[PDB]
Amino acid sequence: AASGSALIFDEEMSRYKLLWTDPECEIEVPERLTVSYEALRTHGLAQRCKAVPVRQATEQEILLAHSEEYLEAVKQTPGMNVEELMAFSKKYNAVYFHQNIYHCAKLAAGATLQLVDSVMKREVRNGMALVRPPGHHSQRSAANGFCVFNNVAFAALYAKKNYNLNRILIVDWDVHHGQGIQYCFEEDPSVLYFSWHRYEHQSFWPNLPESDYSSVGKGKGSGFNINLPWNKVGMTNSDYLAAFFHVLLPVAYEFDPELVIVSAGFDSAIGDPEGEMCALPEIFAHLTHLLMPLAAGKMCVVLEGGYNLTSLGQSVCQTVHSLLGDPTPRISGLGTACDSALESIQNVRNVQSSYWSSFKHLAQSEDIVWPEPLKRMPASVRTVVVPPPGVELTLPKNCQHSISESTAKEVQRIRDKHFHDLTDQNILRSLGNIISVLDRMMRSDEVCNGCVVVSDLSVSVQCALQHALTEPAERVLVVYVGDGELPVKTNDGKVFLVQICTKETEDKCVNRLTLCLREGESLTAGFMQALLGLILPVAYEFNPALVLGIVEETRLMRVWGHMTCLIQGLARGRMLTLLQGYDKDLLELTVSALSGASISPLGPLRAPKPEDVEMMEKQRQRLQERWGLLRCTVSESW
Ligand SMILES: O=C(NO)c1ccc(Cn2ccc3ccc(C(=O)NO)cc32)cc1
Ligand SMILES: [K+]
Ligand SMILES: [K+]
Ligand SMILES: [Zn+2]
């Protein structure tokens, strides 16, 4: 199993710059690279990454995406003086050339291919390339928008040719539309391209009609190009997460890519002079995290744009933190996307509904300042495991088995006050472990999450929940797989209960989400539908301080690892899972996902039952006025 994160960088890519006056071009500067690397070094992140060297892309590699005529033309720019470079630059839009830019372009491209090789060879889990010049605007025969050669396009074409991959996802979260990537894979269903971008009704550069939501691809590629235009500036964390939960992720997990490549422009971050969006650097920690369960974690992040040197360094750090598996920061203040984003989201979902299952829409009808991000630190041990007495297991290197007298006195207090007749000395053991791991998770910063196997469900849950609330945990998200009633009160706003059950039951609290999924071959696709489109939107808005997972002993959850992995985007990754009864496999799967191991892909699934989609949309209707992040349409105004 692959481990580690590659960081691919070279100061040579900082050795070209703009050589004449041009206020529009002067934003793209060498310091973008140096500020990004130095931020990674300052925070100790570069030192934790494998420093794979850059190389030049070969001529044959450049020819995968560009014409001989265009390559030959750019190959002559090293020999040009400044007058000649300016004249060559004016043949293209929004791009400048320099004696060294052809050299650097070949390095930016080779760097990306090195990243692809390291990930696909399993030499690292994932990685990031800090490159100049950017790539995603460059085309078959044109430089465009500071881009010379299309780095991310090369990476997908190279991965197809040399690793015979059938499905590649490209996620372009730069604030500009990567039209060069769109054109490259327009007719290609093997490479799914997603882009959000500032558009403003085509008035924002590059001002293309085909950057709109209606470009879904051509021919066999129809449905494999997804454009999400932002028609207002000021988009927030909530808008970006709505885009992921209600557009990108449902398609990504159904597509089931074999490799994820990210066109990572951070000009979509707050403070950027080109993007003028309002999302915080912390959001990129979660954008990265939400994609990591795809392709067994094989993710290649490639730097595109980003022009506020402060915003840029912080967003690069948040991304690498997540690649290294550090705990995600808590996102507060989430709610509904704005109306213009909901309109863009509504429109993309509708035009894409002929290609993607979950999008169908009827029933039978169809100076800027922001706070510095907090420090993100991996816990001493990530995952504590407490299997039944007398069960020793092989644990991953960042897990550990679990009982002091302070703790022992507390279990005594709890028994005498709340369970008078309880004397099962094994239950009293679990209760001592529950309190002990929670104390390490919450107050100690030494442990991140934990799994405890339990026998008595009610006393275990009550002790876990009540003890967590006084840690203090202002809010606790409970995720319960099983039927029956739990000793959990959801009446004061401190607890949200997600219940995956088998019996259909009436929901009356807006602090509860009950999912009765019809048993069948389709339970997997429906659960993933609910996870990305219902559970995660509410969980992120709730913003809990702790997640409490509970699984009763009463087989069909080939979904648990994805849930465990994605739900660690909440509560800085602080999740306590209580498994009722010993299941060797479920315990090993739970520990593996809790500890940050890569997740096995889901592959293909029978599309969800209409009864399930109906049940889920009734939940969204019932909950979205309280929990606006659930909205994937514009509200109907009175
Ligand atoms: O790559 C980017 N971000 O990551 C990126 C790409 C393009 C631009 C805008 N831009 C930059 C020089 C320039 C010149 C003319 C025009 C023009 O023709 N305007 O109408 C536009 C221009 C900004 C950033
Ligand atoms: K984009
Ligand atoms: K495509
Ligand atoms: Zn950009």
Side-chain angles (χ1 to χ4, degrees), residues 1-40 42-59 61-71 73-363 366 368-374 376 378-391 393 395-396 398-404 406-408 410-411 413-419 422-424 427-428 430-442 447-484 486-488 490-502 505 507 509-511 513-517 520 522 524-528 530-553 557 559-583 585-604 607-608 610-617 619-635 637-638:
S3 44
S5 303
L7 178 69
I8 310 198
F9 173 78
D10 200 287
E11 83 168 52
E12 182 66 18
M13 277 171 299
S14 71
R15 304 204 52 259
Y16 81 89
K17 72 188 176 185
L18 174 62
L19 297 169
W20 52 83
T21 299
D22 186 343
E24 285 174 317
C25 273
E26 76 186 18
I27 57 170
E28 205 291 308
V29 294
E31 289 75 18
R32 307 179 46 241
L33 231 47
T34 62
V35 160
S36 297
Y37 184 72
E38 192 55 34
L40 290 176
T42 287
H43 292 68
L45 291 175
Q47 302 89 328
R48 297 164 57 200
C49 288
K50 172 171 183 197
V52 178
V54 305
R55 72 168 167 91
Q56 288 195 19
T58 68
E59 176 192 60
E61 283 159 349
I62 297 161
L63 289 183
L64 299 164
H66 296 272
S67 65
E68 317 201 309
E69 296 74 16
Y70 173 57
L71 175 53
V74 300
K75 191 174 188 186
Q76 315 309 319
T77 60
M80 288 180 196
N81 61 28
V82 179
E83 179 165 336
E84 289 164 343
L85 290 167
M86 183 188 305
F88 188 85
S89 291
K90 285 160 147 65
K91 302 202 310 146
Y92 304 101
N93 182 230
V95 61
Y96 66 82
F97 281 76
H98 173 286
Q99 287 81 4
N100 202 30
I101 196 174
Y102 173 52
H103 178 209
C104 290
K106 283 183 295 170
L107 293 176
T112 307
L113 300 187
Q114 292 279 71
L115 181 54
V116 171
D117 282 318
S118 321
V119 161
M120 290 312 291
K121 288 157 134 54
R122 316 310 199 260
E123 297 167 358
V124 296
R125 198 174 289 196
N126 59 47
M128 174 161 333
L130 299 180
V131 303
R132 281 175 84 237
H136 69 156
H137 302 308
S138 73
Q139 300 153 51
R140 175 148 277 267
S141 293
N144 187 267
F146 305 131
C147 304
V148 167
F149 300 133
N150 202 313
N151 305 314
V152 161
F154 288 161
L157 290 163
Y158 182 86
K160 287 181 71 192
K161 171 187 213 144
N162 297 116
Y163 298 87
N164 301 122
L165 297 189
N166 290 309
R167 294 182 311 279
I168 297 167
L169 172 66
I170 297 175
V171 176
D172 184 340
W173 74 42
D174 187 281
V175 85
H176 293 99
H177 181 224
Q179 80 276 40
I181 304 184
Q182 174 170 300
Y183 300 161
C184 182
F185 306 101
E186 212 148 40
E187 303 200 60
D188 190 341
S190 67
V191 174
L192 206 185
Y193 179 61
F194 173 90
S195 174
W196 65 32
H197 35 274
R198 177 177 179 185
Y199 194 48
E200 286 183 301
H201 302 304
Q202 198 187 314
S203 72
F204 190 66
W205 189 95
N207 315 105
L208 305 177
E210 58 267 44
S211 304
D212 220 334
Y213 57 81
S214 58
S215 301
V216 314
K218 299 184 197 288
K220 304 264 168 64
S222 291
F224 295 88
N225 192 83
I226 308 188
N227 286 338
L228 203 167
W230 300 130
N231 284 315
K232 291 188 143 44
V233 301
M235 296 304 180
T236 68
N237 300 334
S238 301
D239 299 306
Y240 287 9
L241 288 170
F244 265 52
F245 297 138
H246 303 303
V247 185
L248 169 59
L249 300 177
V251 172
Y253 283 83
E254 187 187 343
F255 186 54
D256 184 47
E258 300 164 304
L259 175 74
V260 179
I261 309 181
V262 181
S263 249
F266 303 104
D267 48 13
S268 47
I270 181 172
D272 194 272
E274 307 298 302
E276 301 176 36
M277 305 306 179
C278 290
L280 299 173
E282 285 87 337
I283 204 59
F284 296 107
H286 293 263
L287 303 191
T288 302
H289 186 252
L290 290 163
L291 300 166
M292 270 172 64
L294 304 157
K298 294 192 293 297
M299 179 186 310
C300 307
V301 176
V302 189
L303 179 65
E304 295 282 0
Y307 303 101
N308 178 305
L309 293 176
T310 308
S311 187
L312 175 55
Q314 299 172 8
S315 311
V316 164
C317 289
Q318 292 293 328
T319 304
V320 179
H321 264 302
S322 277
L323 291 181
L324 292 164
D326 293 353
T328 53
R330 283 173 77 181
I331 310 292
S332 50
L334 291 174
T336 186
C338 65
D339 281 351
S340 164
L342 284 172
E343 174 182 357
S344 301
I345 286 168
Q346 187 165 6
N347 290 343
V348 301
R349 287 171 54 96
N350 180 48
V351 306
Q352 291 285 341
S353 67
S354 34
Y355 311 106
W356 299 106
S357 318
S358 43
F359 289 169
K360 64 67 218 81
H361 86 253
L362 236 13
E366 165 83 308
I368 298 207
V369 196
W370 56 104
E372 257 69 37
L374 302 167
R376 288 170 64 197
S380 302
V381 190
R382 176 160 166 152
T383 310
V384 168
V385 192
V386 34
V391 170
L393 299 199
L395 301 198
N398 53 13
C399 316
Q400 175 210 292
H401 291 252
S402 170
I403 187 96
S404 61
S406 69
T407 302
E410 174 62 18
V411 187
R413 190 194 61 72
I414 294 168
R415 185 237 297 120
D416 295 324
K417 185 187 256 229
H418 296 296
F419 321 93
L422 163 73
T423 163
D424 184 326
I427 294 204
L428 280 295
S430 77
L431 305 183
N433 298 125
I434 289 167
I435 290 175
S436 197
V437 50
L438 281 175
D439 280 320
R440 301 179 71 191
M441 291 167 54
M442 304 305 282
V447 173
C448 190
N449 53 51
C451 183
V452 170
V453 193
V454 300
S455 187
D456 183 83
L457 211 33
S458 157
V459 180
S460 303
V461 177
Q462 215 165 326
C463 293
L465 187 49
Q466 293 297 340
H467 183 77
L469 289 168
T470 58
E471 277 287 355
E474 65 269 25
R475 286 179 301 281
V476 169
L477 170 65
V478 180
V479 177
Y480 168 52
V481 187
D483 299 282
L486 290 181
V488 183
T490 52
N491 59 335
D492 66 342
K494 283 183 241 214
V495 171
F496 191 100
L497 175 74
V498 175
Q499 179 162 6
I500 323 293
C501 55
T502 72
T505 73
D507 259 304
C509 184
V510 301
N511 291 314
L513 163 61
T514 323
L515 301 168
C516 156
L517 285 172
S522 152
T524 301
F527 182 98
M528 286 305 297
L531 176 58
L532 309 165
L534 300 173
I535 294 171
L536 286 182
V538 176
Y540 266 82
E541 187 168 342
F542 191 60
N543 179 22
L546 182 123
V547 181
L548 181 64
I550 307 152
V551 188
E552 84 178 350
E553 202 156 15
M557 29 179 199
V559 279
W560 188 243
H562 283 270
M563 150 88 75
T564 299
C565 176
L566 288 165
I567 217 62
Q568 278 179 76
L570 291 324
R572 287 189 313 141
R574 266 64 190 183
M575 182 180 186
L576 168 67
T577 301
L578 307 181
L579 305 178
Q580 159 160 80
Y582 181 73
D583 181 300
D585 287 346
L586 180 58
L587 176 58
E588 278 167 31
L589 170 61
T590 294
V591 174
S592 172
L594 284 171
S595 69
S598 87
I599 307 103
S600 322
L602 291 173
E611 293 81 0
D612 290 331
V613 197
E614 192 205 359
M615 177 272 295
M616 287 182 283
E617 292 314 308
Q619 294 289 331
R620 188 191 318 283
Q621 293 306 127
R622 194 186 60 83
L623 294 172
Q624 64 186 341
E625 317 168 293
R626 172 59 182 95
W627 307 107
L629 195 44
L630 286 162
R631 293 214 62 99
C632 66
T633 53
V634 179
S635 35
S637 148
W638 166 260

